[PDB]
Every structure is written in structure tokens, then in C-alpha cells.
Amino acid sequence: RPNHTIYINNLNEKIKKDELKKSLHAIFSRFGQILDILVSRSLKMRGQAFVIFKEVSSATNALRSMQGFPFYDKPMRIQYAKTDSDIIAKM
Numbered sequence: 001r002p003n004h005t006i007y008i009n010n011l012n013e014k015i016k017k018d019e020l021k022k023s024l025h026a027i028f029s030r031f032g033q034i035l036d037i038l039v040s041r042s043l044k045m046r047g048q049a050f051v052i053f054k055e056v057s058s059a060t061n062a063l064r065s066m067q068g069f070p071f072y073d074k075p076m077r078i079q080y081a082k083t084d085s086d087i088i089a090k091m
């Protein structure tokens with residue numbers, strides 16, 4: 001099931017969509033090249049987001065290292081996405 005994409009839950013829903021994306025990029029880019037970050041109004045309201053890495057190893061390290069990290073006062077809950085974004089094939 002491990003893939004290039006991590007699905008993040010339990011995100012602070014009071015954070016601005018734009019600021020949230022930027023913060024996610026700052027935090028996760030240290031684990032490897034990020035291809036894309038998915039943060040919509042729908043996802044935001046539910047405290048969810050997706051980060052797509054260029055390599056699966058980067059996704060794995062991110063998942064194992066940032067699990068439970070107090071992001072904006074809330075422990076992040078991270079898992080691999082059920083379906084690896086078709087963006088991988090496209091990009």
C-alpha cells in the first residue's frame with residue numbers, strides 16, 4: 001500500500017488554506033522533493049490534506065517522522081493515500 005502520497009488528518013481547521021499549504025510545504029520538503037500539495041476548501045473544513053512526493057521513500061520517511069507532530073497545536077495523523085494520485089503518472 002505504500003505510495004508517493006500521504007494523507008494527513010486532524011489538521012487545525014482554523015488555519016487559512018493558503019498558510020496551511022505553505023506550512024505543509026516547509027515542513028515536508030525536508031523529506032524530499034514534493035510534486036504537489038492538495039488543500040481545497042472541502043479538505044480544509046475537514047482538516048485533511050495530501051502531499052505527493054516524487055519518490056516513495058520520501059513519503060515513507062515523512063509518515064514515520066511527522067506522525068503525531070503538533071502542527072498548529074494539533075497532533076498530525078498521517079497515512080498513505082488509498083490511491084496514489086494519478087498525478088504521478090501525469091507528472
Ligand SMILES: [Mg+2]
Nearest residue numbers: 035036037038
Ligand atoms: Mg498544486
Ligand SMILES: [Mg+2]
Nearest residue numbers: 064065066067
Ligand atoms: Mg515517529
